[PDB]
């Protein structure tokens, strides 16, 4: 609402980093801008050519747009935004390894399947209420690390989330900051 321009924020961001190149940086820390970075402009972001990590955390981001013109993006982290739908991630889908998106308002996991090479998906204290989304998430062949503590589903579950998580997805190695255990797998076998 005329709060933070991506160019205005990038201007301070590039000046604060004091880096000669506006698209040389692997880690483009645009986090916690003030007033907060509302909606991200794709033409501006396109610049970031060498950026492996793009931290736009803790701002007032409502939508995810302009995956296009992103080459080497490995760890996209848009946590504590106001984001509702995981969409417009087809052009980063080739590279994207980790989608850190905690404390959003992500109710549905519809559009996460485009992420083919996604290794680590942290979406904690989100709005995921049914395990229906987990079946859609199961398409991910390389998904190792998940974080689903604080979601509205794990509240209604009425059992150990660590155990109930591991049993839900066989692919997942780490679930809510745990490691794949022999005792946990046996407990998952006793549950199912």
């Amino acid at each position: 609402s005329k709060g933070t321009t991506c160019q205005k924020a990038i201007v301070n961001w590039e000046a604060a980093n004091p880096g000669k190149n506006p698209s040389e940086a692997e880690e483009i820390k645009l986090i916690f801008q003030i007033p907060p970075i509302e909606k991200m402009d794709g033409p501006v972001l396109n610049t970031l050519t060498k950026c492996k990590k793009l931290s736009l955390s803790s701002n007032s981001i409502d939508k995810m747009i302009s995956l296009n013109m992103l080459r080497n993006l490995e760890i996209l982290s848009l946590s504590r935004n106001v984001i509702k739908k995981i969409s417009g991630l087809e052009d980063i889908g080739g590279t994207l390894r980790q989608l850190w998106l905690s404390y959003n308002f992500i109710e549905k996991l519809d559009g996460l399947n485009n992420c083919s090479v996604l290794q680590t998906l942290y979406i904690g204290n989100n709005r995921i209420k049914n395990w229906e989304e987990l079946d859609k998430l199961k398409d991910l062949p390389e998904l190792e690390n998940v974080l689903f503590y604080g979601n509205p589903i794990y509240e209604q579950v009425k059992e150990d989330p660590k155990l109930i998580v591991l049993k839900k997805l066989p692919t997942l190695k780490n679930v809510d900051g745990y490691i794949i255990d022999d005792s946990v797998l046996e407990k998952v076998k006793q549950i199912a």
């Binding site: 820390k29 803790s58 503590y149």
Partner: protein
């Protein structure tokens, strides 16, 4: 004679990586110890506080970050809070509304703090905490903490101590893995 020179060179890389490992353990110990030495002493003086000030509330947030529970987002219910005598005006996400009323009344408050998972990467939280690290020197300085209250300072020593420990554990794993790999290459070169 070739395999000897190889074993020596790698055995030098062992010693460097051991010293890095040795520097981090102390630095981890130093921090976690202060957290564990506080005990319920400060936790009791918070439970007594009941209606705390807008300075010590932020100090609870830094702790609430590590719990990963009901954390408030966005520039909503936020304003500006005066520091000491100097009429300074700053922009911050502001305390929880009702996250503390639920954290407080939980008797396990002590149990939740006293125990933390080791080798916790917490990239989700450190991204959310990044805003508070650049501002660290303004509010979260010890000399502004102890002034707000003695407990507060311990909790701001509590919150920071974990941030240090985490950073040390995040220097341990990589520089100790590169050690453990090198160590393996030397052992093979010695056998050869």
């Amino acid at each position: 004679k070739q395999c000897e020179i190889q074993a020596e060179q790698i055995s030098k890389e062992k010693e460097e990586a051991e010293r890095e490992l040795e520097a981090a353990l102390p630095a981890l110990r130093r921090a976690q110890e202060a957290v564990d030495s506080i005990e319920s002493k400060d936790i009791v003086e918070l439970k007594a506080n009941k209606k705390p000030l807008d300075i010590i509330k932020y100090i609870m947030d830094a702790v609430l970050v590590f719990f990963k529970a009901r954390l408030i987002p966005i520039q909503i219910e936020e304003r500006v809070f005066n520091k000491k005598e100097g009429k300074a005006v700053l922009f911050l996400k502001e305390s929880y509304d009702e996250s503390g009323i639920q954290t407080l009344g939980d008797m396990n408050f002590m149990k939740k703090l006293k125990e933390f998972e080791k080798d916790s990467i917490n990239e989700e939280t450190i991204e959310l905490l990044e805003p508070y690290l650049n501002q660290s020197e303004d509010w979260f300085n010890d000399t502004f903490a102890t002034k707000a209250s003695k407990a507060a300072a311990g909790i701001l020593k509590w919150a920071f101590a974990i941030y240090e420990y985490h950073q040390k554990s995040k220097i341990v794993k990589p520089k100790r893995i590169q050690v453990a790999i090198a160590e393996g290459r030397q052992a093979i070169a010695l056998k050869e």
